[PDB]
Every structure is written in C-alpha cells, then in structure tokens.
Design a binder for these strands. Structure first.
Lengths: 121, 50, 213, 57, 232
RNA sequence: UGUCCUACGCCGGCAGGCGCGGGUAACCCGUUGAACCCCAUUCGUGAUGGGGAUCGGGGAUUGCAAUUAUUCCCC
RNA sequence: AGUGGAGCCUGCGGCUUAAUUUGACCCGGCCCGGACACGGACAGGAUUGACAGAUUGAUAGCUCUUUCUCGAUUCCGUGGGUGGUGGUGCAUGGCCGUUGUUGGCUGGUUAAUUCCGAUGAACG
C-alpha cells in the first residue's frame, strides 16, 4: 500500500503536523482547528481495544456516534460500530479509508423503489 | 395529538407491521366520529389517523 | 454609612476642624506628622492625611504660609520624588492639589511651580486632572506665566495622545499670557493645524475660542 | 443496563484508625472551619480534605 | 443547561466569606437549573442555621417571583424545593414560616408548596414544631392549607400541640366574618383524624363552634364525627 | 447601504491572506468607473469555439461540526 | 413576451423510509415520583457530599471501582387501609390604565462635570 506515495509503516511513524500536507484541504483545515475531547477519548478507546485483543484476530467492536471524525492512519484494523440513527454498523477500517470521515460508511437512508381502461360496451 | 381532521393515536398497537395487517378496516370514537387508518409511524405501533 | 454623616468629613470637617485647638488655623498638625510622611510608605494612611492637607489650608494661613513656605516646599519636593519612584495615585492626587492651594495663597517658588507643572503630562488621568485644575487656580488667583508657556511650546515640539492634554492646558491658559508668548503660541497652535488629525484640530480651534471669549 | 444505586461501603469501625493506644495518625486541615477534628485523606499520591476539598500532593 | 459544574462552586459551602461570593455571583441572574444545582450542594454538606440563611435570601425570593410570573412553578425549581426539604429544620424557618409571616401568600403559593409536603417525608418533631408556630398567629386564606395537609400527615400529635390548635379554634368564637369552605375541611380533617385524642370539654367546645359558625352543607358531617368520637 | 460598508499598500494565477485609514453618514464607500449597448479580432451552419448538467482531482474561507458534496476558485 | 417540450431549482399531491414535522417529527440513553400501620437495620452505625480512571453514544460520584468526609436529617418490604399542583364557564370584593400651572460623592474610568458604583414641594 501507498498513500500519496507514502507507505503505511512510516505513515504510522509520522506525527500530526507533517500529516497536514498528505491530507486534502478539508482535513487539513480540520486538523488545524483541533480535535475536541469527544474524539480524544474515542481514540484512546480504540487504542485500548487494540491493546488487550489477541494478536491473531480482530479486536472487539467499539460503538460510537462520532460520524464527523476523520480516520487517522493509526486507526487501521479497528472495529468501529458507527451509528446511522437506527443501528450500529460494524466497519473494519482498511488502509484505503484514510482521508474519509466515519459517517459515510453508515448510510442513514434507504433506497427508494417505485392497468389501463379499455371499454367493453 | 389532534389537528384539523388529523390525529396520531397511541397504545392501539405495539408493532409497526400490526397496523399494516389491520389497515383496511375502519375506526370509530365513543362520541360518534369515524376514522380511517392512514399510515404507520414506526416501531411502537403508533399510527396517524384521519 | 459613615461618609454621609454630618460628623463625617463631608460637612463638619470643612467647618470646625480648621479651628485647630479652637483657633483657625494652626499648621502644627502638619508640622507634627513628618514621621508619617518620612520613612513610612503605608498606603491609604498617606492618602487620608492628603485629604485634610488639601481641605484645611484653604482657610488663609497666609502669613503662616509666607514664613514656612520653604519648610512646606522641601516637605513636598521630596514627596514629588518619593512615590514617583513607587507609582501610586491616591497619595498623589491630593498632595498636588494642596501644592496648588499653597501656591495660590502666595526664586525657589518657580521650582515648586515647575514641580506642579511637570505633572500635567502624567499618563494617569486623576493626577493630570487635578494638575490641570491646579495650574488654572494658581495663575488666576503674572511672573509665573512666562516660564509655563515656555514649557507648553517645547512639549508640543517634542511630540500623539499627550498633545490633547497640552491643548487642554492651553485652552484656558492663553488669556494670562503676554504679547510675545501669544505670538509664539499663535504659531505653535497653527503648526499642528498642518497635521490633518481631527481631535487635535478641534481642541486647537476651541482653544482660540477661549482666547477671544 | 438498569440504573443501579450506589451503596455506601460499611467500613467496620472507621472511627478507630486516627490514633494509637495518643497523638493523631492522620493530618489535620490548615483551614479555619476545617481543622482540629477534620482529618485528611492519605492517598497513595495525594492528600484530600472531606469538607473543603483541599488537595495537597 | 447541563454538564459538570466548575469546582470553584463546590467549595462555596466550605468557603469563609459566602456573602461577598454570593452577592457578586448575582443569584437573581442565575438560570432555573442553577437553583437545583445550588440548593443540592447548599443542603448537603452545609450546617442547619447556615442553610436557613441561604433559603431566606435566595431560595424564597426565587420561588416567589416565578410563581408570580408564570402562575406555575418550574420543574427545576420544584426539585430545588424537594431538595431543600431534605433539611426540615432550615426549610421550616427559612421557607415556610417566613412565607407564612409575609402576609402576601396566596392560594397558588399555598397549594403548590403544600403538595411538596404531601409528596415527601418530614420528621414528626420537626413537623409538630410547625404545627404550634403556625397555630399562634392570625388566619389568612392560605395558611389553612398549611394546617390541613399537615393534619393529613397522621403523625403522633403531642398533646401540648393539641391545645394550641383548639386555642386557635376557640379564638374564632365571636367573629362574624364568613368562614370559607376550605376552613371547614380543615376542621373536618381535624375531627376525622384526632377524634380519639380530644377531651370531653373539648368535645362540647367544637360543638358550640358548630352552633355559632355552621355550614349549610358540611356542618352535619362535622357533627357526625364529633358524636361518634371515642374518649382517650 | 451601513458600524458594518469599504478606500489604499504588499503577496498569490484565482478564490483568498497581512497591515493601515474614512464614515452613525447629502461628511466614507461614491465624480456609486453596473450590465445589456458601442468599436475592432477569431469562429462559419458543424449538437459547433452554441448549451451547460452530471462527474474526477486539488486549493481557500465561515463555522463547536461541512459525510449525503455549507459556500467559493482552478484544471 | 411567453409558460406548456429539455437540464436544474422550488410548492402542492402521490410513492419509499424510522421520520422524510404541519395546515415541531424518528431512534436511543438520563432525571424525578406519597404519607399511615406492621416486621427488620440504625451510633458497633442509619445516611449526605467527593479526587482519580472507566462504562456510556459521551461525561457523569445522576452510573462502575479506591475509600475520603456529613451524621438521625434515618432506608428495605408487605397491605385492595387514605391520596387533583387538573384544565374550563357563571354571580362575586378591592386595584391600575381609560374615557392644567409654578417651583426645587469613598472608589476605580475618560480628550472631556466622560464611563460605571452608593445616593423634594405647593397653586388652579
């Protein structure tokens, strides 16, 4: 895997302030504006779940409502239960979802799915 | 809740698809007014009635 | 609760305390508190004595003021240096007014006059406000007019915010000037007109009004 | 997910820990209303006051 | 609205100078949720006479104007008065009796705080002190509600208190002013609950009170309870 | 029209940044330098240099937050 | 000059959805909730408030742990034994608004008696 010509392993070594240029313009603005307490606490919970999990299967599912939090490169391999308003969608974070949010993998709406007179007398 | 020829009724049923099974039969009040099951509201048997 | 009383400093201190011992007015009190004005920098104790220092000396100890004017002047020219190093206001505002009070009733005198005058440019507004009012009462109540105009002209040439205070000083001090200093002031007020700044322009316009009115 | 109520831990003879035999085993608060009777907590990283929430580390 | 309060608030009960702190905090400018937050901490770890001072200056004014504005008591202010009733000694002498002695209390103020008394538990010795104190002073259109609901508590009435109530009733012997219907149910509940603790001379004392001050509807029921009353 | 309207200088290609001033207003924006219109150039009846939807990639700004594209700009 | 035909946007119906709020709604998670009697526990202790971390969808002593502090302000159960903060209309007592004239400064703040803080009488 390569992301913007950068492989995964040194992307995990890479800190926040030089992740600014690898993201797009939207995520670059968001990272400058900071991350609130709600997503700092969640990142610890994914870090805790990856810590105690067995090293040969996926970790336990973490349920959250944070649909507006971008996917940092250290989140790969996690089990996040993301909520669409009705149920929790369990999504497994592949390394190809780095610049994207969490809300667009739990769709909040369902698709829509949509005999003539002939006279006898 | 009651509006002009529009009402929502609670505690008649508890599941969403109960009212779909009992849709085509009419409804009435103790005070003479009649009504028709219009559409389910969801997940607790609530419906909107006209 | 204790300021609005008749026994408070509002009314009766202005009447009966001037009779120091029953006879008005003895300055033996101010000639007794040197141990408070010297080697004591306790705040609000020098302030309260500064209130009575301004309040009492209005009631004409003028023969007393003449003889021990030098005693008062040395008792305050060191005060002008002392809390100028410390930087207070409450002890400072009344002691400048009582200096104006003693100067109003009256070679060494002009140095005290320059001590009163040099505090007009002070950044703190209360200290400036009393000095602004103090200079007016001293001159209107003159040999001191020539030197103070020479201070006024040089201060304008040295300098934006301080010039507003100086034009306020020149607002009601032009009428007590001689011819040559009015002619020099008429140039100096006209020099800042070349600057397009509006607040200095309006005050200098209003300064000429108080000259002619 | 029923809301269970807190039950206070009934510590048996909690009074009998602030002294030996004479002197006070625990600290006393240096405040005005709290002190001379108000004992302080002795935690493993802090000292805590049960009345005025005074914290010493 | 919600969330955790700053820790500078949780030391005000144990702070030395509450008066300067509370006055600079502008208690009238607080929100409705702040009353439930402040009363909770000011009645939890705070002493009795101290908490009575807080009720008089803050809680009693804030409960008076709100019911005078919307003719209804807010939910948050209701739980504030519920939490104030956790300390009954401070609430009686800080909220109840000062409202009783104000003289401007109405039916709505009486009927709203009266339900709080019914909905919660009050110690008998604290409640019996409120019985004697309200029985001594004069009678208005609102303090009767304070009587009848407290008679509905069905506590073990001390016998000295029973003299104080009947002295209040014997005080209403020669007055020609019309007694309201709500005064009769106050009398009806009294003879319903404490018929076994009234004396034989007190038995006839209420009877002549029924003779001089009758009711076209309720007086025979008051007559029925008296005539079917067992002595001590 | 407004205390949010903006002048001017510098930077970037554009959205946009940094600084410093005027105006409670027939006083500054503002001699309100508006668009069709007018004069030259290229195109030449061709779903075409008409038409712009729908899309891909990137950048900037307001917001606690831009995902189901807040909005704006470039290809 | 158009609209009606094309693309986009907007409103009524209709169709799908949990709701697509109406001529605020849908999923979840909290808050609160009698007294009387009797039987229990209750200074050995009834009970209140709390630092740190976590569950949680988050924080939150309104929760799950480590025990710090307040103390009678008590808290567990069983009874067919009592229990309007209702909304709404009529008669009903008081009270406002509704159909002239003459007088009369501790303090911090600013270019400035600038800013904020305490603080009356008669005549027609």
């Amino acid at each position: 895997f390569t992301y913007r010509g950068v492989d995964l392993d040194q992307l995990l070594d890479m800190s926040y302030e030089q992740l600014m240029q690898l993201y797009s313009a939207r995520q670059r603005r968001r990272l400058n504006r900071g991350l609130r307490r709600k997503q700092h606490s969640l990142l610890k919970r994914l870090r805790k779940a990856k810590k105690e999990a067995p090293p040969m299967e996926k970790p336990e599912v973490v349920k959250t409502h944070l649909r507006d939090m971008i996917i940092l490169p250290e989140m790969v391999g996690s089990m996040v239960g993301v909520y669409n308003g009705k149920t929790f969608n369990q999504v497994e974070i592949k390394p190809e979802m780095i610049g994207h949010y969490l809300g667009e993998f739990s769709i909040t709406y369902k698709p829509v799915k949509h005999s003539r007179f002939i006279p006898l007398k | 809740k009651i509006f002009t020829k529009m009402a929502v009724v609670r505690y008649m049923f508890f599941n969403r698809e109960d009212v779909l099974w009992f849709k085509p039969v009419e409804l009435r009040t103790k005070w003479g007014r009649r009504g028709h099951i219009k559409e389910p509201l969801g997940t607790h048997g609530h419906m909107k009635c006209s | 609760a204790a300021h609005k009383e008749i026994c408070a400093v509002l009314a009766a201190v202005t009447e009966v305390i001037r009779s120091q011992g029953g006879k008005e007015t003895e300055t033996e009190y101010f000639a007794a508190l040197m141990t408070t004005m010297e080697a004591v920098e306790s705040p609000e104790s020098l302030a309260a004595v500064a209130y009575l220092l301004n309040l009492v000396l209005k009631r004409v100890p003028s023969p007393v003021l003449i003889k021990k004017f030098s005693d008062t002047s040395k008792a305050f020219m060191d005060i002008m240096s002392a809390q100028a190093s410390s930087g207070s206001t409450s002890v400072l505002r009344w002691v400048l007014s009582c200096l104006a009070t003693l100067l109003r009733k009256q070679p060494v005198t002009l140095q005290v006059y320059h001590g009163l005058l040099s505090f007009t440019v002070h950044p703190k507004p209360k200290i400036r406000k009393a000095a602004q009012h103090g200079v007016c009462s001293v001159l209107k109540g003159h040999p001191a007019a020539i030197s103070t105009a020479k201070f006024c002209i040089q201060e304008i040439e040295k300098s934006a915010t301080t010039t507003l205070h100086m034009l306020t000083l020149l607002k009601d001090l032009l009428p007590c000037f001689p011819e040559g200093l009015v002619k020099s002031c008429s140039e100096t007020l006209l020099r800042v007109m070349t600057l397009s700044h509006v607040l200095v322009t309006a005050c200098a316009m209003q300064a000429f009004h108080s000259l002619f009115h | 997910p029923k809301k269970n109520k807190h039950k206070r831990k009934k510590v048996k003879l909690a009074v009998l820990k602030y002294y030996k035999v004479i002197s006070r085993l625990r600290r006393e608060c240096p405040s005005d209303e709290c002190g001379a009777g108000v004992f302080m907590a002795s935690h493993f990283d802090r000292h805590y006051c049960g009345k005025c929430c005074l914290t010493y580390c | 609205r919600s969330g955790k309060l700053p820790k500078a608030f949780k030391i005000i009960p144990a702070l030395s100078n509450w008066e300067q702190i509370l006055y600079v905090t502008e208690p009238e400018a607080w929100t409705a949720a702040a009353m439930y937050q402040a009363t909770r901490i000011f009645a939890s770890n705070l002493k009795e006479r101290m908490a009575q001072r807080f009720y008089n200056l803050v809680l009693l004014p804030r409960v008076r104007d709100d019911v005078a504005e919307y003719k209804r008591l807010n939910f948050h202010l209701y739980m504030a008065l519920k939490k104030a009733l956790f300390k009954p000694g401070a609430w009686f002498k800080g909220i109840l009796i000062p409202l009783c002695e104000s003289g401007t209390c109405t039916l709505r103020e009486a009927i709203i705080v009266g339900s709080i008394i019914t909905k919660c538990s009050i110690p008998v010795l604290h409640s019996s002190a409120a019985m004697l104190k309200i029985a001594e002073m004069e009678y208005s259109g609102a303090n009767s509600i304070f009587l009848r609901l407290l008679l509905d508590k069905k506590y073990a009435l001390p016998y000295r208190v029973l003299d104080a109530l009947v002295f209040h009733f014997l005080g209403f012997r020669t007055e020609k002013r019309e007694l309201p219907v709500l005064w009769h149910q106050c009398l009806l509940t009294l003879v319903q609950r404490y018929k076994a603790d009234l004396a034989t001379d007190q038995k006839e004392a209420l009877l002549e009170l029924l003779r001089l001050q009758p009711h076209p509807q309720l007086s025979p029921e008051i007559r029925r309870e008296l005539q079917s009353a067992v002595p001590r």
